[PDB]
Design a protein around this ligand. Structure first.
Ligand SMILES: N[C@@H](CCC(=O)N[C@@H](CS)C(=O)NCC(=O)O)C(=O)O
Ligand SMILES: N[C@@H](CCC(=O)N[C@@H](CS)C(=O)NCC(=O)O)C(=O)O
Ligand SMILES: [Cl-]
Ligand SMILES: [Cl-]
Lengths: 207, 206
């Protein structure tokens, strides 16, 4: 109740939801729609009208990268979400959060109606194929990294893994080819076997 | 002991500006669209993109990660972490993420990212769309800057360096920044900054 996470089921807010559960923090979910996000109540809270938003008392934090880092910062060290807690450890988490946040996530724009302005069905389809080809390349990079690493950063689970997992769920909704990416596949299954991930998916109605 | 891999005027200029503000000792390593795809740099960064910050044998690559690392190593007296609280770091992070994940990728069609469309009219529509979406994002920044001189905690941070760098691209690609007086004043404050000027000059920019 002191902390409220504004979510849309299956959206990027799911990464923050997963991390909150891994941190062991007490929090309250506030459910939003593509309609309720654009309503004046949430626009007063976040003018951008986009999820996630994390309310800590009267303070409203908005970027996934900022929220994930904030949850990491407040989590007790025993939860192991900051690695050894050094500058290098935080930098490793940050680089992999930025990979999902600024390389992976925006490549999904064409796959979530971002290219509707093209009007031409063939052009819209080409933009989607391009997004899938570029995403395939990015996921091959993540898979190559996961072949020799347990987790993305510092060999320990972090907000970086929660974010990568959420993008993989989108890949599995928009037709991104993840075949022959065995390390990435094992990572996805490890995540889905996790009680914190399962609790989050269930609470959001993705079961 | 630190080496920053740059391309003149690229997103790496934000890290360059912050390194000057931090007072840190650093070397610049200049790259091309060709030298970045060369095997020597691909061994350091397989993504074949700038920035990259080398600290000894360690190579750090994401802009957001580099900006936060520079902030973390800067002496407290430099005032790049605000009051230094979790809320202060979160305010810096939200504004870094705004330029990193909202502004920066909207420039993709404006920098040849929609060439696959082939048809010139469709490529032009993708550029017009990128410009329209960017004016909306810059209106948001302008609305925030109407009541704040700096993006986070009323004190200069890596967030300010990043927003300024994209505003340089806006001017080069035809993004409409008219009637955005607070963002215009921000751009002017930045260009008058000695650390910014020192960075622009070292990069051979104007
Ligand atoms: N850079 C922002 C992006 C925010 C964003 O893309 N939010 C999406 C959720 S994935 C959203 O609200 N989409 C639907 C809408 O705006 O109606 C962040 O990572 O928090
Ligand atoms: N998410 C990455 C994006 C990296 C990136 O976009 N780098 C650009 C510089 S603006 C680049 O190297 N562009 C041209 C190229 O790859 O040839 C970050 O912020 O560091
Ligand atoms: Cl990376
Ligand atoms: Cl923001």
């Amino acid at each position: 109740h002191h902390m409220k996470l504004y979510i849309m089921p299956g959206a990027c807010s799911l990464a923050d939801h997963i991390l909150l559960r891994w941190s062991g923090s007490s929090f309250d979910l506030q459910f939003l729609d593509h309609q309720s996000m654009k309503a004046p109540e949430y626009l007063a809270l976040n003018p951008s009208g986009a999820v996630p938003a994390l309310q800590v008392g009267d303070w409203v934090l908005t970027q996934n990268a900022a929220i994930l880092n904030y949850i990491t910062d407040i989590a007790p060290a025993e939860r192991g979400l900051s690695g050894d807690g050094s500058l290098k450890a935080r930098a490793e988490i940050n680089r992999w959060i930025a990979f999902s946040n600024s390389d992976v996530h925006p490549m999904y724009w064409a796959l979530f109606g971002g290219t509707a302005y093209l009007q031409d069905p063939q052009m819209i389809a080409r933009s989607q194929d391009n997004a899938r080809q570029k995403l395939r390349v990015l996921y091959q990079r993540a898979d190559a990294h996961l072949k020799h690493h347990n987790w993305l950063a510092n060999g320990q689970r972090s907000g970086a893994d929660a974010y990568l997992y959420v993008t993989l769920r989108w890949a599995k909704k928009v037709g991104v080819d993840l075949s022959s990416l065995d390390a990435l596949s094992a990572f996805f299954e490890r995540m889905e076997a996790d009680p914190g991930v399962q609790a989050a998916l269930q609470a959001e109605g993705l079961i």
